[PDB]
Amino acid sequence: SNRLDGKVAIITGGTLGIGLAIATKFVEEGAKVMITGRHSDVGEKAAKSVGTPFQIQFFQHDSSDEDGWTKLFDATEKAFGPVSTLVNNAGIAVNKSVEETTTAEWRKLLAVNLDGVFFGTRLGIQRMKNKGLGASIINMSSIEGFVGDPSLGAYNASKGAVRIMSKSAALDCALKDYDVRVNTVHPGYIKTPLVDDLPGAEEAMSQRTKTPMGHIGEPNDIAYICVYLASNESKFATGSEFVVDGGYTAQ
Amino acid sequence: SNRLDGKVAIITGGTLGIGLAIATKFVEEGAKVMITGRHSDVGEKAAKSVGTPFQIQFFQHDSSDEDGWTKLFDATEKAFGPVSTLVNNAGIAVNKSVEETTTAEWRKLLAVNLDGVFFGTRLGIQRMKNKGLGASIINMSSIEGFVGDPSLGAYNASKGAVRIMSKSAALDCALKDYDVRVNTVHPGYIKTPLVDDLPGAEEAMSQRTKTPMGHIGEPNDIAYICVYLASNESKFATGSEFVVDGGYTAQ
Amino acid sequence: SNRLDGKVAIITGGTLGIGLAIATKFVEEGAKVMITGRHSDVGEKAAKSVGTPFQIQFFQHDSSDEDGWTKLFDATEKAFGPVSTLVNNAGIAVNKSVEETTTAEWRKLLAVNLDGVFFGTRLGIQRMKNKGLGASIINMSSIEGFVGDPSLGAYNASKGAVRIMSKSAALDCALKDYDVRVNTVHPGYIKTPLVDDLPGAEEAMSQRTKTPMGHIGEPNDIAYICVYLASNESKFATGSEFVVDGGYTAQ
Amino acid sequence: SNRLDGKVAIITGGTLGIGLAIATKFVEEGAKVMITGRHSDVGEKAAKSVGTPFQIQFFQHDSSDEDGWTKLFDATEKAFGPVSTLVNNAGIAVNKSVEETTTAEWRKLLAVNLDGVFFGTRLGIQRMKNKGLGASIINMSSIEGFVGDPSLGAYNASKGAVRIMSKSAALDCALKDYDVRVNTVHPGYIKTPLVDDLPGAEEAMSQRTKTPMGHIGEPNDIAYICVYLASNESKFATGSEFVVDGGYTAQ
Ligand SMILES: [Cl-]
Ligand SMILES: [Cl-]
Ligand SMILES: [Mg+2]
Ligand SMILES: [Mg+2]
């Protein structure tokens, strides 16, 4: 308990599923949290469901929106004081092979999944370096950052990019003594309402040729590894990849 | 707090350095612990330094000793009840290139670092499967399981072996619904009394071309990732590698 | 000899350095080659230096230019018949950390290094599937696709993207029986006239803490692995990463 | 043609399947070859099938036999002159999970697959260093060196060991300017008479959930990457992993 004492976290895509579980456990461990999402309806309800505005607030933002990133860091500092912790969790999927990806689909997915993580990482380093915060940037980088999927071409590109860009940022922050760590988290298949809304999706993901455990994960599985990485417990972990996938990548 | 409620852990090489830190944090999180080591003098003192014999005990054992593994699981069950958690941390180093490794050095190091982890993993699966324990085997597998070191040839062999053997065991346990997870932890350079006893060793390990953070870790850095992996917080993590190395492998 | 009998290859950035060496060895092994580059002065001289217009031609192209990719495949087919082989070699570097990367630098580098490899791979699959050509797409994906560099943030993002996007494409082509393979090549540091023009670059690259061989490579080092991947010798290799780096990533 | 001009190669387990194909292509490319195997009936027939005793000979040897390794290098030097090239191909498999592996099975498999590769690599470095031979050690390290298989526990241990031990040897040889390269080759599933003798093996290996190409490879698939690694074409490749697996590890 109090594993995130004094921390101030931004969690992009924090209004549902994995992001909301990360936000929930972060508040339970003593962090102040600003969650982001595209929809005020979802986001204001989500913040209130977790805690008071002294614990957690919502900021409406598309991660692809560069100017919005400045507003987001300014709003979080105004509410909670200097930001110590950034979880770049916002992402979209296109269910196309490379061959069948349109240029419009390619640009839209990279704008959220890659540009957004770049904008957040770049700004996070500038705003959180050299303040003795034990600062931590956690980039969501998928099992699709390790292995290909024939029907997730653009998503694979974005997650590979996040995986190695995060190492670059980890190294620069370490070498310059910035007191900022950067790591990637790689979820396998996770049961969310969105999976539950697609008939047969969980059953397909639970086949042993996909997930050896024969079931898929829950959002708290990703929340717990994020608490470790945001905490000072992980002060020697930087430039690392943390996989939580039911054995998906082990075979 | 109470993150290892009800757990019963064996930690090999648990009498000093990283193993002792893992044992200390495991007891602090509510686990019963049996630590092993070659020397009764070190081991009985270490157990008493951490807690009462109702919390932690010592069992004298060389991990290379196959028959001793049976005695160790029997003694732990007699003291604390069924074992839920095994940390295979016992290991030795030979400071020779492959070229300059004698056959006697090769066999001695593999007996501890590889045979020992095999004997512990094999027995752990048999003893901890199908009991609803949330069982977890944590194999120590080094940054030397990912990258070569020209003067650690046999050690590199042993750590590569542990890395991939652990995936095999993770997959079999997952596919057979055994309720046993197997993961590897990969420390970079860690400050211990043994490092402190070698003049200039910490300074060499802290050079940026080795450890980008410009310093080395402390035993608690490895203890915290082991608490996560032993706990039910990591119930969807199996067959994964967890690196805590100050950026060593990121460059 | 004749290891690329009947092959028709496009090599982007084929007018200089690594691309020119690949083109030279491809023509030697019996391939017909279209090389691309931004500058017709360089490109027309380069094609004539290697062979006759029945062996090798130049097509002026920026790999970021989507419409130009269509014209490039059309021109290659007109000159040499159906394309069997694509080497996505064109690339640029920005020598900035993630922190210091401007948005204009980010967008410019991703346009060439990521968008261009996507446009080439997508069009390559569409044009070379189901023609019994033994088709092969070779993506240049850098050692910077495996490890971070603190001063190559955008470059690392682009090379990690190419690494995993290529696996996606490899799998879709294999599962659909397209007779198209996709693989990545990961050069370490290679001596080119351009490296010769950067004072101290080769010397810095040649430090044992960077390249263990204590020297950097030459363009033919990359040409020879590309001949293997373009040829039918590699008909069971798809979704693989081929590193030629002097030991850079082994430590 | 003549890609292995002047080379003198030892190929362990060179009398059947993959080893025999490597030997066949090595002789075709101008190498002198000593093949090893346990059975003189098979070995003498295999050598005569490929070439004359001035091109290729057989030496009876179990790779687990340390004293026999000395006699093998002595016999090869006597027949062909100084050895330039070693392919550590000899291997055995036990079809047991870690849980089900007997100690006798463990020790027997490690004696061949790990001890034998150590004995060969160590002796190879000692005999081929500092002779200007362009020396090359190629270690067979399996897709089972990258991913687990629930029913290949000891095999996975041995192949992970070879993978990382080879990086250690590569680095020491590079740093000491020995003119010795060390690399690993990782075959996927390969059709051999031995696979043909296991009912349903090829069919199981050919499922898209195992090999995405929907078929397995042939021995020449491994021979061609070994020619590249033995030749001076690969003079900048050391400490690298070369996977030829039909897409097995890409998903
Ligand atoms: Cl040009
Ligand atoms: Cl034989
Ligand atoms: Mg490195
Ligand atoms: Mg896989």
Tab-separated table of N, CA and C in Angstrom, chain A residues 146-215:
chain	number	residue	atom	x	y	z
A	146	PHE	N	6.447	-7.588	-30.696
A	146	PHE	CA	7.424	-8.702	-30.712
A	146	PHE	C	7.209	-9.625	-31.912
A	147	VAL	N	5.959	-9.949	-32.198
A	147	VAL	CA	5.622	-10.900	-33.277
A	147	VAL	C	4.681	-10.215	-34.259
A	148	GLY	N	4.701	-10.705	-35.483
A	148	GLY	CA	3.769	-10.236	-36.501
A	148	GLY	C	2.398	-10.848	-36.303
A	149	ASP	N	1.388	-10.169	-36.823
A	149	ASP	CA	0.040	-10.749	-37.036
A	149	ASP	C	-0.321	-10.388	-38.463
A	150	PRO	N	-0.685	-11.368	-39.309
A	150	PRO	CA	-0.926	-11.082	-40.719
A	150	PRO	C	-2.039	-10.062	-40.998
A	151	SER	N	-2.965	-9.874	-40.053
A	151	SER	CA	-4.101	-8.941	-40.229
A	151	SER	C	-3.973	-7.718	-39.313
A	152	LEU	N	-2.757	-7.383	-38.864
A	152	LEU	CA	-2.502	-6.174	-38.032
A	152	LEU	C	-1.249	-5.438	-38.504
A	153	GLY	N	-1.118	-5.218	-39.814
A	153	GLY	CA	0.129	-4.696	-40.400
A	153	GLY	C	0.511	-3.349	-39.823
A	154	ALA	N	-0.386	-2.371	-39.878
A	154	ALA	CA	-0.080	-0.998	-39.409
A	154	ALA	C	0.122	-1.023	-37.887
A	155	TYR	N	-0.680	-1.803	-37.177
A	155	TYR	CA	-0.582	-1.921	-35.701
A	155	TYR	C	0.790	-2.480	-35.330
A	156	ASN	N	1.238	-3.532	-36.022
A	156	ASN	CA	2.595	-4.122	-35.856
A	156	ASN	C	3.654	-3.027	-36.077
A	157	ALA	N	3.554	-2.256	-37.164
A	157	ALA	CA	4.519	-1.158	-37.418
A	157	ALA	C	4.561	-0.240	-36.186
A	158	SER	N	3.404	0.219	-35.726
A	158	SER	CA	3.330	1.206	-34.615
A	158	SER	C	3.941	0.607	-33.345
A	159	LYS	N	3.688	-0.664	-33.059
A	159	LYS	CA	4.138	-1.263	-31.777
A	159	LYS	C	5.640	-1.571	-31.832
A	160	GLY	N	6.171	-1.980	-32.989
A	160	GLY	CA	7.621	-2.133	-33.151
A	160	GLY	C	8.311	-0.797	-32.957
A	161	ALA	N	7.727	0.267	-33.506
A	161	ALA	CA	8.295	1.627	-33.415
A	161	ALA	C	8.368	2.019	-31.941
A	162	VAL	N	7.271	1.845	-31.212
A	162	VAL	CA	7.220	2.238	-29.780
A	162	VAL	C	8.278	1.444	-29.006
A	163	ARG	N	8.399	0.151	-29.278
A	163	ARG	CA	9.340	-0.735	-28.571
A	163	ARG	C	10.755	-0.147	-28.639
A	164	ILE	N	11.228	0.235	-29.826
A	164	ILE	CA	12.672	0.588	-29.973
A	164	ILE	C	12.862	2.083	-29.699
A	165	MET	N	11.889	2.921	-30.049
A	165	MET	CA	11.953	4.370	-29.732
A	165	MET	C	12.077	4.533	-28.219
A	166	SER	N	11.378	3.697	-27.458
A	166	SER	CA	11.409	3.764	-25.978
A	166	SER	C	12.825	3.484	-25.459
A	167	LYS	N	13.544	2.546	-26.075
A	167	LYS	CA	14.944	2.231	-25.690
A	167	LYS	C	15.812	3.459	-25.945
A	168	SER	N	15.631	4.122	-27.079
A	168	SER	CA	16.414	5.340	-27.410
A	168	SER	C	16.224	6.364	-26.288
A	169	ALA	N	14.970	6.615	-25.945
A	169	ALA	CA	14.623	7.613	-24.910
A	169	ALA	C	15.169	7.179	-23.543
A	170	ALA	N	15.034	5.906	-23.172
A	170	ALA	CA	15.594	5.365	-21.910
A	170	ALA	C	17.096	5.671	-21.839
A	171	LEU	N	17.825	5.397	-22.913
A	171	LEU	CA	19.295	5.551	-22.927
A	171	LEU	C	19.661	7.033	-22.777
A	172	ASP	N	19.021	7.915	-23.537
A	172	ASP	CA	19.364	9.356	-23.481
A	172	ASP	C	19.107	9.880	-22.066
A	173	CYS	N	17.971	9.538	-21.476
A	173	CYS	CA	17.628	10.002	-20.108
A	173	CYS	C	18.649	9.463	-19.089
A	174	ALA	N	19.045	8.200	-19.206
A	174	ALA	CA	20.045	7.566	-18.315
A	174	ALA	C	21.393	8.287	-18.466
A	175	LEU	N	21.852	8.481	-19.690
A	175	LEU	CA	23.208	9.030	-19.942
A	175	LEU	C	23.291	10.487	-19.483
A	176	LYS	N	22.193	11.220	-19.575
A	176	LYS	CA	22.137	12.656	-19.206
A	176	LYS	C	21.729	12.832	-17.732
A	177	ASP	N	21.529	11.744	-16.985
A	177	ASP	CA	21.205	11.807	-15.531
A	177	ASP	C	19.911	12.610	-15.319
A	178	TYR	N	18.908	12.408	-16.170
A	178	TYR	CA	17.621	13.142	-16.128
A	178	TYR	C	16.668	12.665	-15.020
A	179	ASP	N	16.903	11.512	-14.397
A	179	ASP	CA	15.966	10.942	-13.387
A	179	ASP	C	14.624	10.645	-14.078
A	180	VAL	N	14.676	10.153	-15.311
A	180	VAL	CA	13.480	9.680	-16.063
A	180	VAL	C	13.786	8.283	-16.603
A	181	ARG	N	12.937	7.312	-16.295
A	181	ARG	CA	13.027	5.948	-16.846
A	181	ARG	C	11.967	5.807	-17.932
A	182	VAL	N	12.272	4.997	-18.935
A	182	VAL	CA	11.316	4.692	-20.019
A	182	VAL	C	11.324	3.178	-20.246
A	183	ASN	N	10.153	2.560	-20.189
A	183	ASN	CA	9.999	1.099	-20.354
A	183	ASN	C	8.746	0.852	-21.180
A	184	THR	N	8.647	-0.350	-21.722
A	184	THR	CA	7.471	-0.771	-22.522
A	184	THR	C	6.784	-1.946	-21.836
A	185	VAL	N	5.463	-1.942	-21.929
A	185	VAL	CA	4.603	-3.051	-21.444
A	185	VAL	C	3.919	-3.673	-22.658
A	186	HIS	N	3.854	-5.001	-22.676
A	186	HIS	CA	3.420	-5.766	-23.866
A	186	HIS	C	2.325	-6.721	-23.441
A	187	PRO	N	1.073	-6.246	-23.373
A	187	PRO	CA	-0.033	-7.145	-23.083
A	187	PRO	C	-0.278	-8.143	-24.211
A	188	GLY	N	-0.596	-9.370	-23.829
A	188	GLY	CA	-1.318	-10.290	-24.707
A	188	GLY	C	-2.795	-9.950	-24.703
A	189	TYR	N	-3.633	-10.901	-25.081
A	189	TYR	CA	-5.096	-10.686	-25.184
A	189	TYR	C	-5.698	-10.518	-23.787
A	190	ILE	N	-6.520	-9.479	-23.644
A	190	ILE	CA	-7.134	-9.069	-22.351
A	190	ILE	C	-8.651	-8.984	-22.540
A	191	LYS	N	-9.407	-9.582	-21.622
A	191	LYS	CA	-10.884	-9.525	-21.621
A	191	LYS	C	-11.311	-8.107	-21.223
A	192	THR	N	-11.982	-7.428	-22.139
A	192	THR	CA	-12.598	-6.103	-21.921
A	192	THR	C	-14.027	-6.171	-22.433
A	193	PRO	N	-14.912	-5.221	-22.055
A	193	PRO	CA	-16.225	-5.117	-22.692
A	193	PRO	C	-16.189	-5.132	-24.232
A	194	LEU	N	-15.178	-4.529	-24.862
A	194	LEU	CA	-15.039	-4.519	-26.345
A	194	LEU	C	-14.859	-5.949	-26.872
A	195	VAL	N	-14.030	-6.765	-26.226
A	195	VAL	CA	-13.892	-8.206	-26.579
A	195	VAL	C	-15.235	-8.904	-26.342
A	196	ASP	N	-15.888	-8.657	-25.203
A	196	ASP	CA	-17.176	-9.309	-24.843
A	196	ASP	C	-18.262	-8.982	-25.870
A	197	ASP	N	-18.166	-7.830	-26.534
A	197	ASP	CA	-19.164	-7.343	-27.520
A	197	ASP	C	-18.956	-8.001	-28.885
A	198	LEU	N	-17.848	-8.716	-29.090
A	198	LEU	CA	-17.593	-9.397	-30.383
A	198	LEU	C	-17.808	-10.897	-30.201
A	199	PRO	N	-18.946	-11.468	-30.664
A	199	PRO	CA	-19.207	-12.890	-30.459
A	199	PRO	C	-18.050	-13.770	-30.943
A	200	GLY	N	-17.600	-14.690	-30.091
A	200	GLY	CA	-16.557	-15.673	-30.435
A	200	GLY	C	-15.133	-15.148	-30.297
A	201	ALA	N	-14.920	-13.862	-29.995
A	201	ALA	CA	-13.559	-13.273	-29.990
A	201	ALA	C	-12.738	-13.884	-28.844
A	202	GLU	N	-13.281	-13.874	-27.627
A	202	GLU	CA	-12.566	-14.433	-26.456
A	202	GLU	C	-12.238	-15.909	-26.714
A	203	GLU	N	-13.192	-16.673	-27.242
A	203	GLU	CA	-12.989	-18.122	-27.490
A	203	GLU	C	-11.817	-18.308	-28.468
A	204	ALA	N	-11.759	-17.517	-29.538
A	204	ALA	CA	-10.677	-17.604	-30.546
A	204	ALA	C	-9.326	-17.274	-29.901
A	205	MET	N	-9.289	-16.215	-29.093
A	205	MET	CA	-8.051	-15.740	-28.422
A	205	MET	C	-7.563	-16.743	-27.368
A	206	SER	N	-8.469	-17.578	-26.857
A	206	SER	CA	-8.210	-18.549	-25.766
A	206	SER	C	-7.744	-19.903	-26.311
A	207	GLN	N	-7.780	-20.098	-27.630
A	207	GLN	CA	-7.283	-21.365	-28.211
A	207	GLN	C	-5.794	-21.480	-27.862
A	208	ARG	N	-5.325	-22.692	-27.588
A	208	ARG	CA	-3.950	-22.920	-27.068
A	208	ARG	C	-2.894	-22.493	-28.090
A	209	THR	N	-3.202	-22.556	-29.386
A	209	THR	CA	-2.290	-22.107	-30.463
A	209	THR	C	-2.120	-20.582	-30.424
A	210	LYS	N	-2.992	-19.869	-29.697
A	210	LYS	CA	-2.870	-18.411	-29.446
A	210	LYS	C	-2.323	-18.209	-28.036
A	211	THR	N	-3.145	-18.470	-27.032
A	211	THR	CA	-2.776	-18.229	-25.618
A	211	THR	C	-2.651	-19.573	-24.920
A	212	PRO	N	-1.421	-20.057	-24.657
A	212	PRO	CA	-1.225	-21.360	-24.024
A	212	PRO	C	-2.000	-21.589	-22.722
A	213	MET	N	-2.247	-20.539	-21.942
A	213	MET	CA	-3.021	-20.700	-20.679
A	213	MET	C	-4.475	-21.111	-20.959
A	214	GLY	N	-4.983	-20.970	-22.188
A	214	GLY	CA	-6.342	-21.424	-22.546
A	214	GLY	C	-7.425	-20.468	-22.068
A	215	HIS	N	-7.021	-19.268	-21.675
A	215	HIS	CA	-7.930	-18.145	-21.373
A	215	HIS	C	-7.161	-16.862	-21.602
